[PDB]
Design a protein around this motif. Structure first.
Motif, mmCIF file in Angstrom:
data_model
loop_
_atom_site.group_PDB
_atom_site.id
_atom_site.type_symbol
_atom_site.label_atom_id
_atom_site.label_comp_id
_atom_site.label_asym_id
_atom_site.label_seq_id
_atom_site.Cartn_x
_atom_site.Cartn_y
_atom_site.Cartn_z
ATOM 1 N N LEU A 100 3.003 16.416 -3.679
ATOM 2 C CA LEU A 100 4.207 16.091 -2.924
ATOM 3 C C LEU A 100 3.946 14.909 -2.005
ATOM 4 N N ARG A 101 2.780 14.893 -1.373
ATOM 5 C CA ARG A 101 2.418 13.797 -0.488
ATOM 6 C C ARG A 101 2.391 12.534 -1.322
ATOM 7 N N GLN A 102 1.914 12.686 -2.546
ATOM 8 C CA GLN A 102 1.839 11.567 -3.450
ATOM 9 C C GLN A 102 3.287 11.126 -3.648
ATOM 10 N N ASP A 103 4.154 12.085 -3.993
ATOM 11 C CA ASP A 103 5.572 11.802 -4.209
ATOM 12 C C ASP A 103 6.229 11.129 -2.990
ATOM 13 N N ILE A 104 6.032 11.704 -1.803
ATOM 14 C CA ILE A 104 6.606 11.174 -0.564
ATOM 15 C C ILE A 104 6.306 9.703 -0.298
ATOM 16 N N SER A 112 14.343 12.243 5.603
ATOM 17 C CA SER A 112 14.567 11.733 6.959
ATOM 18 C C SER A 112 13.329 11.464 7.808
ATOM 19 N N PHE A 113 13.572 10.945 8.999
ATOM 20 C CA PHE A 113 12.497 10.641 9.924
ATOM 21 C C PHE A 113 11.930 11.953 10.444
ATOM 22 N N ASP A 139 -4.013 7.089 18.514
ATOM 23 C CA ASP A 139 -3.534 6.473 17.278
ATOM 24 C C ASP A 139 -4.490 6.827 16.131
ATOM 25 N N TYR A 140 -4.770 8.117 15.978
ATOM 26 C CA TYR A 140 -5.667 8.582 14.930
ATOM 27 C C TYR A 140 -4.966 8.769 13.598
ATOM 28 N N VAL A 141 -3.688 9.122 13.651
ATOM 29 C CA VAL A 141 -2.919 9.335 12.432
ATOM 30 C C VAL A 141 -2.711 8.041 11.659
ATOM 31 N N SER A 142 -2.836 6.921 12.362
ATOM 32 C CA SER A 142 -2.656 5.598 11.778
ATOM 33 C C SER A 142 -3.482 5.341 10.525
ATOM 34 N N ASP A 143 -4.266 6.325 10.089
ATOM 35 C CA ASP A 143 -5.090 6.149 8.890
ATOM 36 C C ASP A 143 -4.610 6.936 7.677
ATOM 37 N N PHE A 144 -3.535 7.702 7.858
ATOM 38 C CA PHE A 144 -2.988 8.511 6.780
ATOM 39 C C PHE A 144 -1.728 7.930 6.154
ATOM 40 N N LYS A 145 -1.496 8.291 4.898
ATOM 41 C CA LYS A 145 -0.323 7.846 4.157
ATOM 42 C C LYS A 145 0.701 8.968 4.289
ATOM 43 N N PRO A 148 6.465 6.275 3.063
ATOM 44 C CA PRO A 148 6.578 5.022 2.318
ATOM 45 C C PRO A 148 6.638 3.869 3.317
ATOM 46 N N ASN A 149 7.473 4.028 4.339
ATOM 47 C CA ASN A 149 7.614 3.015 5.372
ATOM 48 C C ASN A 149 6.411 3.074 6.294
ATOM 49 N N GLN A 150 6.280 4.172 7.027
ATOM 50 C CA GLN A 150 5.169 4.346 7.959
ATOM 51 C C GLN A 150 5.332 3.473 9.188
ATOM 52 N N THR A 151 6.119 3.967 10.144
ATOM 53 C CA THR A 151 6.386 3.271 11.403
ATOM 54 C C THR A 151 5.685 3.974 12.565
#
Length: 279
Positions: A100-104, A112-113, A139-145, A148-151
């Motif tokens: 699912l993460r792959q899908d997301i 949604s956000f 800002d540790y999460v800044s390394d995960f996918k 798609p956008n990632q803001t």
């Protein structure tokens, strides 16, 4: 022959099968093991790329299926469970979340956000564990996918949620992510571009529910499996037939036209499989 399977976590598994090795039936069964998966049947199944998938046929030698193509595949969920909580093991939910993460990330499951930040946070638990200011840098999460956008704004909501999660086990974090993804429409929906007898650019979709038709959005139609008596194709024509629901006598047969017979045989193939994997 040397196989290269791209695993659900951007990791490549490599191995060697005999030249006349049956489809995934062997390579996949092999792949199962490396991942210590017990629930083979589900989603879990392998395929080769080119924009959109093509399931390696489990009952035919791998050789024919990759003529003019390297023996490279990807391990994936082929049959998404409607209610993941019903699954027997957690490794299974673990891989389902991976899918699912792959899908997301590839917009295959738009949301949604809020939804994104929710699922994001649970993903952070699973992967990281209780917050703990060793997950240094605000800002540790800044390394995960996570999207798609990632803001940054999205990251904040996640870290915010991640912190409120304490003593949450990975299996738990996973089940919360799944209970939420489960709900999204599009969850476990194989999208195939097509057209309707009118020149209309529609989009078929396959999933445990049945066959779904789209157009910009509109779930235009929805043909549930036990509400289907036959699936077939002739050239670039796909055909589902049976029950109009109410008006008896009637036993419609809607038709669509895919770009090629390849596309149609493909859709025809997936459809017969789903209709068979779910009552």
């Amino acid at each position: 022959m040397h196989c290269k399977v791209s695993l659900l976590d951007d990791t490549v598994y490599e191995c060697v099968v005999e030249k006349h090795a049956k489809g995934q039936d062997l390579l996949k069964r092999v792949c199962e093991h490396l991942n210590l998966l017990e629930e083979d049947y589900f989603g879990l199944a392998i395929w080769d790329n080119a924009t959109s998938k093509t399931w390696l046929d489990s009952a035919k030698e791998i050789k024919k299926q990759v003529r003019g193509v390297p023996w490279n595949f990807t391990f994936n969920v082929k049959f998404y469970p409607p209610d993941p909580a019903q699954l027997t093991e957690d490794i299974t939910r673990y891989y389902l979340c991976l899918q699912l993460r792959q899908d997301i990330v590839a917009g295959r499951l738009p949301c949604s956000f809020a939804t994104l930040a929710l699922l994001g946070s649970y993903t952070i638990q699973s992967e990281l564990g209780d917050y703990d200011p060793e997950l240094h840098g605000v800002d540790y999460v800044s390394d995960f996918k996570l999207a798609p956008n990632q803001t940054k704004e999205l990251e904040e909501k996640v870290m915010e949620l991640h912190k409120s999660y304490r003593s949450m086990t990975p299996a738990q974090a996973d089940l919360e992510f799944l209970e939420n993804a489960k709900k999204l429409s599009m969850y476990g929906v194989d999208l195939h571009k097509a057209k309707d007898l009118e020149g209309v650019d529609i989009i078929l979709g396959v999933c445990s529910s049945g066959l779904l038709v789209y157009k910009d959005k509109l779930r235009i139609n929805r043909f549930p499996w036990p509400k289907v008596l036959k699936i077939s194709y002739k050239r670039s024509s796909f055909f589902i037939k049976i029950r109009p629901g109410e008006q008896e006598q009637y036993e419609s047969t809607i038709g669509f036209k895919l770009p090629s017979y390849r596309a149609a045989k493909k859709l025809w193939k997936v459809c017969v499989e789903h209709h068979t994997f779910f009552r």
